[PDB]
């Protein structure tokens, strides 16, 4: 049997890697965490260090407040009973204010107010985290591709719980915080808007989601296939093309008639993934604001 390089055969370890300095404020980096031999069979065994400045503290605090606000509501619904908490965990849900309250914040805590509070914490957590992706890249002198890509995901998220509800005139339009409940919300959304399979942006979003699995399967497999030539050392193959990048390119040129480059494949990758939520956000934002029924819309288009 041939070694497939899915799991490493032997792990090696040296002094903890503290990372590059560049313009980073080292005072904000923790010490290294423990080493995981388990993780090491697949990826890096090293945990940490992590960077936690003020913005990061805010993001984590806010994120946890979001999580705890939902959790306290769950215990409440569970009658504070531990056994009930676990058996009905997926049924609990923190719902938005009723339609009657519009976009106001005058709804009782048990009837929407608490949802607004949790949502506020989540809003701060996500945006401050986005700031983190931008600043950690800046401090290292790197491009801002990660922050820009993250924005696409944020777009769908914003449309779902903020932009669309506001355009629709009520918080009742937003997604509830619950495992099963957000799924019921999803099914209901499609039913009420004439079946999302008729929303062209939903179909595109699906093409890109499937396309992302197709592409990562292709790319991941390709790199592993040429790892025997150092193929995974992508930055250097970009700066100085080796036989790994050439064989990868030719496998595809010979298979489907065209190919990419070591750098270019990553551009196909970032866009394929980013377009999932980009088209999706548009599709959802237009739902109920401009198009009430996609089936009907499709009949006239």
């Amino acid at each position: 049997a041939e070694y497939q390089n899915i799991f490493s055969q032997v792990q090696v370890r040296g002094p903890a890697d503290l990372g590059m300095t560049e313009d980073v404020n080292l005072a904000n980096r923790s010490g290294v965490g423990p080493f995981s031999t388990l993780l090491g069979w697949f990826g890096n065994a090293q945990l940490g260090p992590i960077y936690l400045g003020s913005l990061g503290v805010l993001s984590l605090f806010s994120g946890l407040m979001w999580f705890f606000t939902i959790g306290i509501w769950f215990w409440y619904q569970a009658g504070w009973n531990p056994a009930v908490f676990l058996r009905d965990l997926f049924f609990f849900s923190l719902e938005p204010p009723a339609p009657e309250y519009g976009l106001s914040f005058a709804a009782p805590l048990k009837e929407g107010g608490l949802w607004l509070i949790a949502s506020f914490f989540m809003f701060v957590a996500v945006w401050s985290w986005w700031g983190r992706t931008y600043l950690r890249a800046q401090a290292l002198g790197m491009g801002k591709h990660t922050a820009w890509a993250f924005l696409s995901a944020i777009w769908l998220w914003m449309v779902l719980g903020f932009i669309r509800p506001i355009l629709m005139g009520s918080w009742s339009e937003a997604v509830p915080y619950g495992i099963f409940s957000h799924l019921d919300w999803t099914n209901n959304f499609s039913l009420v808007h004439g079946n999302l399979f008729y929303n062209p942006f939903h179909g595109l979003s699906i093409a890109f989601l499937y396309g992302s699995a197709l592409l990562f399967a292709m790319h991941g497999a390709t790199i592993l296939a040429v790892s025997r030539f150092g193929g995974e050392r992508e930055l250097e193959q970009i700066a100085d093309r080796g036989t790994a990048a050439e064989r990868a390119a030719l496998f595809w040129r010979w298979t489907m008639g065209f190919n990419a480059t070591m750098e270019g494949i990553h551009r196909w990758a970032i866009w394929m993934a980013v377009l999932v939520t980009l088209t999706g956000g548009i599709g959802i934002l237009l739902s109920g604001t401009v198009v009430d029924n996609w089936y009907v819309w499709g009949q006239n288009h």
């Binding site: 590059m20 992590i50 995974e232």
Partner: protein, 281 residues
């Protein structure tokens, strides 16, 4: 025409069948025995679809639809115009996909690389086969398979899903979706990271793998590494498809009631089933 660095790799050898008989290229495409097989299966399949289109009475891309035999036919054969064409086209598709995978294997052999790509492709093929072959056979009829139509196959997805209530409740489906979402997340991150290092701030030198590891450790306290991220992307995408095939192979076979009710086994656990309070009490 050839890429500037291509000629040195265009040597003889690697074929699985026919020796040097089909060992050549047509433009950029490698042929090989399976290249001829794929063309044969694909051409026939496409010709049979056009014929199905004639029997349907339309040439419109968005209207052409080849349906499998009605349930009454069970797993037997059917008249061409009544499901038979679907049956032949499905055989052609399977032949074309498998041949495409085998051609990839010959290409791997000539290039001296690993067989990871065709192996990964086999997962997609198996998912397709679960829907048109394994599931229908287990259920007792070809009619359970999806039709070959741009919009009609979506009708099948919607109809099949709602046959079990909100399909979101299928636990295997939840896992598959988790892998699909996580995969796209990982793809965006991988593409953005490599690009952010290769295309740093204006005027700066290319960043290094060290900078990539540093960026992620700074951000979330962990970096999987360059080898790991490619292993991950592959594992996430294949896992997503594996659980997709699984979520459908068990639907209509071992589980055929409303998926939401499956979750009753947990709620009805003796030690808390009758405890008052909560949503289920």
């Amino acid at each position: 025409a050839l890429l500037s660095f291509e000629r040195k790799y265009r040597v003889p050898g690697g074929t699985l069948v026919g020796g040097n008989l089909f060992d050549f290229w047509v433009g950029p495409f490698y042929v090989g025995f399976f290249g001829v097989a794929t063309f044969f299966f694909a051409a026939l399949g496409i010709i049979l679809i056009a014929w199905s289109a004639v029997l349907q009475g339309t040439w419109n891309p968005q209207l052409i639809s080849v349906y499998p035999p009605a349930l009454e036919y069970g797993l037997g054969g059917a008249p061409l115009a009544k499901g038979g064409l679907w049956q032949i086209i499905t055989i052609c598709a399977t032949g074309a996909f498998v041949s495409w995978a085998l051609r990839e294997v010959e290409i791997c052999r000539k290039l001296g690389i690993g067989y990871h790509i065709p192996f990964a492709f086999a997962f997609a093929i198996l998912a397709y086969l679960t829907l048109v072959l394994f599931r229908p056979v287990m259920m007792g009829a070809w009619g359970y398979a999806f039709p070959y139509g741009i919009w009609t196959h979506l009708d099948w997805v919607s109809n099949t899903g709602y046959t079990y209530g909100n399909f979101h409740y299928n636990p295997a489906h939840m896992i598959a979706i988790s892998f699909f979402f996580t995969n796209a997340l990982a793809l965006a991150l991988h593409g953005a990271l490599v690009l952010s290092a290769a295309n740093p701030e204006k005027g700066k030198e290319m960043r290094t793998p060290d900078h990539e590891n540093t960026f992620f450790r700074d951000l979330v306290g962990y970096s999987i590494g360059t080898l790991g991220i490619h292993r991950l992307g592959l594992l996430l995408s294949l896992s997503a498809v594996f659980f997709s095939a699984l979520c459908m192979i068990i639907t209509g076979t071992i589980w055929f009631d409303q998926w939401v009710d499956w979750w009753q086994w947990w709620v009805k656990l003796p030690w808390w089933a009758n405890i008052p309070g909560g949503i289920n009490g």
